[PDB]
Amino acid sequence: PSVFLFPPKPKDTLYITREPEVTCVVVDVSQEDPEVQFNWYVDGVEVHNAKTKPREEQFDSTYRVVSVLTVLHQDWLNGKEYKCKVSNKGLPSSIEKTISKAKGQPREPQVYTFPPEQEEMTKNQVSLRCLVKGFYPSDIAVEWESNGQPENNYKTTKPVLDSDGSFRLESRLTVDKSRWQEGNVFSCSVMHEALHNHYTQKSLSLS
């Protein structure tokens, strides 16, 4: 009977028109609905604006209950503590979790792009690489774009810790070789709190 607490999507905290939320999940292998209750707290003060969904059966036959707490962009970025406490109805025993933005001087990402490797120029689909390093905290969003429109066909690694305490990750965008050959510009878009206006972009095209 275990509880998970997830931070907001990094993009949501960095763009004020987005709706960042923290997410509390209860996973339970037992059919018996124990009628879980959530208490939420921001820096130890209970709040009441969480939206909790009904118990649902998962594909693996376990049961999960999801509770979402809307958060203020600055509240997350200023290191406020989000506490999820879970109770079965009228039974005082409880499990809690706490998360918060990691502490430490924010550091700006450095962004590198790489064209496809030439022994890949024999394939129908080629890869573009965006390497991002030197950043703190780990909270970051990496996306791609071309001709002012999003590219969805990318995979991004989990953040890895370098030995100076800053993080790094790599994204790879897979596109049809014809698109790369026709001279289209592909932008790696990087969103991090330590970047000016939380955004920078590096661009890649054939010459």
Swiss-Prot record:
Glycans are attached at residue 60. GO terms for molecular function: antigen binding; immunoglobulin receptor binding. One of its GO terms (biological process) is complement activation, classical pathway. Residues 1-100, 109-205 form the Ig-like domain. Residues 1-103 are annotated as: CH2. Disulfide bonds join 24-84, 130-188. Keywords: Adaptive immunity, Cell membrane, Disulfide bond, Glycoprotein, Immunity, Immunoglobulin, Immunoglobulin domain, Membrane, Secreted, Transmembrane, Transmembrane helix. Coiled coil: none annotated. Residues 104-207 are annotated as: CH3. GO terms for cellular component: blood microparticle; extracellular exosome; extracellular region; extracellular space; IgG immunoglobulin complex; immunoglobulin complex, circulating; plasma membrane. Constant region of immunoglobulin heavy chains. Immunoglobulins, also known as antibodies, are membrane-bound or secreted glycoproteins produced by B lymphocytes. In the recognition phase of humoral immunity, the membrane-bound immunoglobulins serve as receptors which, upon binding of a specific antigen, trigger the clonal expansion and differentiation of B lymphocytes into immunoglobulins-secreting plasma cells. Secreted immunoglobulins mediate the effector phase of humoral immunity, which results in the elimination of bound antigens. Immunoglobulins are composed of two identical heavy chains and two identical light chains; disulfide-linked. This is Immunoglobulin heavy constant gamma 4. It comes from Homo sapiens.
